[model samples]
Target: CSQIWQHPRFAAKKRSSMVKFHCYTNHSGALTWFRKRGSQQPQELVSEEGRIVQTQNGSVYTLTIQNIQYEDNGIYFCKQKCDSSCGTELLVL
Candidate 1:
C-alpha cells in the first residue's frame, strides 16, 4: 500500500509546453519531483513558480513543467519520504 501510480504513462507535447501530470499514492508528505533526460542522472525539481501543487487532503500530487523545450523531454518522478511514483515520460515535439 506504498506504491505510486502515474497517469497517461506517456505524454507528448510541443515546444514550450505547459504540462502538469498526476501522481497518486496511499501516503502523504512533502512531495519532491525529479527528472532525468535520457541517460542523465535524475535531478530534483523545484515547486516554485507554482510548478507543483498538492491536494489539500493529500494522496494526490500535481507537477507542472511550467515550460518545455528539447532539453525538457524526459522522465519525471514524484516522491514522498521514500516511496516514489512511476516515472512519467514526456516527449517534446
Candidate 2:
C-alpha cells in the first residue's frame, strides 16, 4: 500500500520495435502486468520468449515486449494499479 510503479510512464516506439517496462513494487505483488488498448478492452502478455518475456532480477521485475507491432500500442498498467497513475502510455510509431 506504500509504493508500486513503472518507469518511463510514457513511450512511443516504431512498429516491430520493442519497449521495456520496469515494474516496481513492494514484493506484495511483483509479477502482475496488464495492457489496455484505448479503453476498448483489457489484455495481458505471453509467458514464453516470443512476445513478452517477464524477467526477474530479484529486486527488479521487468516486462520486455518484443515484436511490437502497431497492435501493441496501448496503456500498460501495473498489477496493483493502486492509484492508476503509474501506468504506461505506449504509442506505436
Maximum-lDDT candidate:
2
RMSD in Å for all candidates: 3.4, 3.8
State candidate 1's TM-score.
0.74
Residue-level lDDT tens digits of model 2 in 1-93: 236678778889888888888877775545567888876666766664568887767766788888778777788876753432467889988
Candidate 1 C-alpha lDDT tens digits along 16-83: 76887877776566566688887788888755566444333266677767667777688988777465
Give lDDT: candidate 1, residue 1: 14
Question: Where is model 2 poorest over a 10-residue stretch in terms of lDDT?
Answer: 77-86
Q: Which stretches of candidate 2 lie over 4 Å from their true place?
A: 47-49, 80-85
Best by TM-score: 2
Backbone clash total for model 1 is 0
Cα lDDT over the full model 1: 0.72
Q: Which stretches of candidate 1 lie over 4 Å from their true place?
A: 47-57, 81-85
